[PDB]
Amino acid sequence: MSHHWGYGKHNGPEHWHKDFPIAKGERQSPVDIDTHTAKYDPSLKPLSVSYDQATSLRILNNGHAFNVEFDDSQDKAVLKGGPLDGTYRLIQFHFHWGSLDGQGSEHTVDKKKYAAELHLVHWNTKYGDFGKAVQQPDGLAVLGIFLKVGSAKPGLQKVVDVLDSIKTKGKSADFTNFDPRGLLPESLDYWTYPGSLTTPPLLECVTWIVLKEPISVSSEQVLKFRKLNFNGEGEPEELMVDNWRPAQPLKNRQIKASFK
Ligand SMILES: [Cu+2]
Ligand SMILES: [Zn+2]
């Protein structure tokens, strides 16, 4: 929110608190997931990812990442169960990634950084619209999935192949008839905790659900992410890499596990 924040030395995560003081708040994201301290929670309900009727619309370079946007005017693609009360509707997904394969994720697992992290963003339908949802402590649910470099992910290739058409900030392209189920791992085992948006405005509205099993993507797929630009057309080229916030203090939170 507001202008001029980014991921450089002069406007990156260490600077955000000056315009977004909640950056130093009590439930900021991402965090390190200490797997030995997370506790199994038998009260968690089964997690339900219901994306069969998902209706993708468009892909946009917003100068911070790229978003694949969905029709959220009806319950076409929803997340329910797990730690969640009620129904959360899919609005968009995006990624965070590194300049090198050893960094890029926002969450870490026993301090391990993955090459990238996928965020599927959903809003609680009891609040009527996304903008109202971000005024509520249970307004959003983000499903986070780690990416490691190995074999190609077939379900990612349609995304990689459109990126040359959205190289610079402000560009968009049609992205209809995409199935986001092709981005999931086999297992839905997860960790969950209460947190925030990981970019400005850093609002403390998110139930995080982070899957334990990473997806594998090829070196060639992640290399195509790294050819995007932060800048607009006609401006000095600034590669879109290292668009991740580091782990923040856990403070008075417990991370729960869905699995023993
Ligand atoms: Cu501003
Ligand atoms: Zn994100």
Ligand nearest to the CA of 67: 2
Any residues with CB less than 8 A from the CB of 115 and at least 6 apart, and which? 97, 98, 101, 102, 103, 104, 105, 147, 148, 149, 217, 222
Cα 237 from Cα 258, distance rounded (Å): 43
Point out the annotated binding site for substrate.
Answer: 198-199
CATH number, position 74: 3.10.200.10
Q: Taking the CB of residue 211, how many other CB atoms lie within 10 A of it?
A: 21
Q: Residue 5 C-alpha to ligand 1 middle, in angstroms?
A: 8
Number of domain units in the chain = 1
Structure tokens at 243: 């668009």
CA angle, residues 227, 228, 230, in degrees to nearest 5: 130
Residue 128's region, left for phi above 0, alpha for psi from -120 to 50, else beta, is left
- State the burial class of residue 155 (Cβ atoms within 10 Å of its Cβ: 0-12, 13-18, 19+): middle
Cα 122 from Cα 141, distance rounded (Å): 5
Cα 121 from Cα 93, distance rounded (Å): 6
**DSSP assigned state of 181:** G
Peptide bond before residue 30 is cis, with ω within 30 degrees of 0: yes
3-state class of 151 per DSSP?
Answer: coil
Q: Is the dihedral of CA 184, 185, 189, 195 positive or negative?
A: negative
4 is catalytic: no
Q: Residue 240 C-alpha to ligand 2 middle, in angstroms?
A: 14
Domain span at residue 161 reads: 1-260
Resolution value (Å, 1 decimal): 1.0
**DSSP assigned state of 114:** P
